[PDB]
Symmetry: C3
Subunit: 280 residues, 3 copies
Amino acid sequence: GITARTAPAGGEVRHLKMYAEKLADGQMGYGFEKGKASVPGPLIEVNEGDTLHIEFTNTMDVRASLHVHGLDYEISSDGTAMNKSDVEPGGTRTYTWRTHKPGRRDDGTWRPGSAGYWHYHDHVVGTEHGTGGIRNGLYGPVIVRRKGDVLPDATHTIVFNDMTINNRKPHTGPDFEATVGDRVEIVMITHGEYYHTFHMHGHRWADNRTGILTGPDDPSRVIDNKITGPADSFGFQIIAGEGVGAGAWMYHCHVQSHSDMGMVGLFLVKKPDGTIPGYE
Amino acid sequence: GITARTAPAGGEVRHLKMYAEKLADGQMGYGFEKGKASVPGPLIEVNEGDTLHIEFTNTMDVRASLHVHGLDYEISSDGTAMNKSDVEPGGTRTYTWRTHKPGRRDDGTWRPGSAGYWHYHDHVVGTEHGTGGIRNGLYGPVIVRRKGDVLPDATHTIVFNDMTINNRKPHTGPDFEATVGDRVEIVMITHGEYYHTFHMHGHRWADNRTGILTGPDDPSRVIDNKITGPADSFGFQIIAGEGVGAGAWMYHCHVQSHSDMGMVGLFLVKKPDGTIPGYE
Amino acid sequence: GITARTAPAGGEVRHLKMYAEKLADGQMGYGFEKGKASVPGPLIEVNEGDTLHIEFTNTMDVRASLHVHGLDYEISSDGTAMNKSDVEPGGTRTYTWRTHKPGRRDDGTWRPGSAGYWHYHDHVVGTEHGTGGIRNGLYGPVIVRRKGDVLPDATHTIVFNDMTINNRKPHTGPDFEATVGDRVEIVMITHGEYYHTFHMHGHRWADNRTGILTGPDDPSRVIDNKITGPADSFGFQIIAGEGVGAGAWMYHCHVQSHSDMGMVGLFLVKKPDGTIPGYE
Ligand SMILES: [Cu+2]
Ligand SMILES: [Cu+2]
Ligand SMILES: [Cu+2]
Ligand SMILES: [Cu+2]
Ligand SMILES: [Cu+2]
Ligand SMILES: [Cu+2]
Ligand SMILES: [Cu+2]
Ligand SMILES: [Cu+2]
Ligand SMILES: [Cu+2]
Ligand SMILES: [Cu+2]
Ligand SMILES: [Cu+2]
Ligand SMILES: [Cu+2]
């Protein structure tokens, strides 16, 4: 990018609060604020090098925790019962996540950076693998940017959790809206028991770290369909309606009974006047 | 390549006819000609930049459609009931598929080309996700070449559709024949309910866009076994018998009960005299 | 690497003996020595260009064979009943595996090398696809090094075989030990009926051939979770505790009922004094 906005260098030390709470309908969610928990939990986005101190508070009546993929954490912040890293009811604990930039090691080899599309979830509700917590909605996305990564206009999180999208009832979305030409980022995560295949009409991306081709030398497959299983995460960016125009573009699990049973949503791409060809 | 044949630049405007018909045994297939429908449907192969206008005719007594992966289409050619893009019985509709070359966008980023191994299928028979159409045989392969892509001697399509290969009865192939040294292209597609793993004896390929390593810098895994789920597509080329000689080489799903129940075929690689060591 | 040990050029002609035997508890395993069979079978590791002649002896009362992924073999060493390549009870057969370096073909294209993480298993016990042999433990890892590949301090093999890790009873590991800073290689293989997702706490790797990023230009996704199905194999290296320190780090299938039912182990990373923070 040379006109798109790109990520700066980290790393700052950042602090934030998270809460786990039971929702009125029986679900459980994370939130940055007591009373404003969501499923998925809020996006946490940092730059390679950042350190994040999370003051986590379990407001529920059962033990709960916070476990992250991909990022550096000491065993103190594992989020597991086994290393006494979870949180008693009403309790409070400070988790620490660090991230690093890539570079040469002394042995001459190349250390990978932390950058990528990751996620966090509970590891102790219902079972010692968080099966109950995850089923109830205790998951959320984490993005770590490499210096110079292209930044989007908007980021959406899509989570295939067992037979639901974002724990929603069958055939109730979510739907997302964009205007032709928007740079839209998708963070796609899978949880539970089943494998799925994520499919998007009218759009495609690269099957690599960023979902974007670096330039003509990148041999990564360009795809519009990807098989995923529990705790897989990936992400990409697309230009809404690029080459295809406005429309009510479906995304869905392409497993046939899954889409049939409601794992379907809409990517609503609008003309500037806000209209969508052949929609309602 | 510098002696293998390679793809030219597109794009021309191309026209063709497709038909959907019910087959005598209950299946449904696509064809370029009325009376000559097949499962899989015919290969459609174009060059990046080409535009294809498909005059599609539903000869069946139920609504049917044509939905493509990967290629650019306006929402008019979605192939879905939702955007009134399917076709009434006996009806005729012109779908339009476009393809583009990669290149710089104004923001300085890199737009991916359309090139790759794709497929088309019905989206409205039986359910609004084409579950019935796909089960009955309404699928086929699409290949889009990048300028300079290596062209094969022959292309074969292998479709894992639920528990069948190409809708065939258990243990009935298909089998494919080559002579030692042939450049054979495989287009491999999955449909239905189940995940599979595609495996080939005696041959391997690169897990990237083309299935071929560009040269020594490509870090892609070289494989002979790949997990696939519904609506996944990939493709590759191999040199028949390279380093291994002639033989009756099995390919199969490596899921153990699947191969046991008949998801097996033969890649028959022959010496010039047409004989195969230790075969029949 | 420029201080890590790296692989030399092959290829030598190497000979070895393998045996298949029934174990006292009903399982079946491979071994380099009669009486010392294991599940997984012993690691076989060679350099690109090597040739390996394996004098294989079936010590069991049923026919059995040796089938390899990835490596060059003539149809004589297919390991299948179909090409009369298996071994009668008490019988002995010499299998031959070859490997090649990458390079230009005459047509100007690039031939892939044999290098990668592969495996071997039976193809005739119980069924003609070795379903019984594989279930009983007749599998093992094969590594083929490219010249200049980084060599590890230790290699561990993790095999998801149906609902077991390395055919072990639920919740019995295996556990592996390292000291902070060790270069640990993992060879991960899946067998049987089911898909799994392999997950490691505190560590991540590159999703390419070697599991290592070549340098800053490699766009491969960096991951800590990977979906695998029957007969998939991959491998990687990590630095034990890099950025995270010592600890009892879990690895497990992330399919929720699988981890719940016991597909869990420990990567025990120790301080030099041998202690592990918050472990026992
Ligand atoms: Cu875990
Ligand atoms: Cu699904
Ligand atoms: Cu589609
Ligand atoms: Cu997890
Ligand atoms: Cu669709
Ligand atoms: Cu299968
Ligand atoms: Cu094989
Ligand atoms: Cu589709
Ligand atoms: Cu086989
Ligand atoms: Cu599993
Ligand atoms: Cu984890
Ligand atoms: Cu195999």
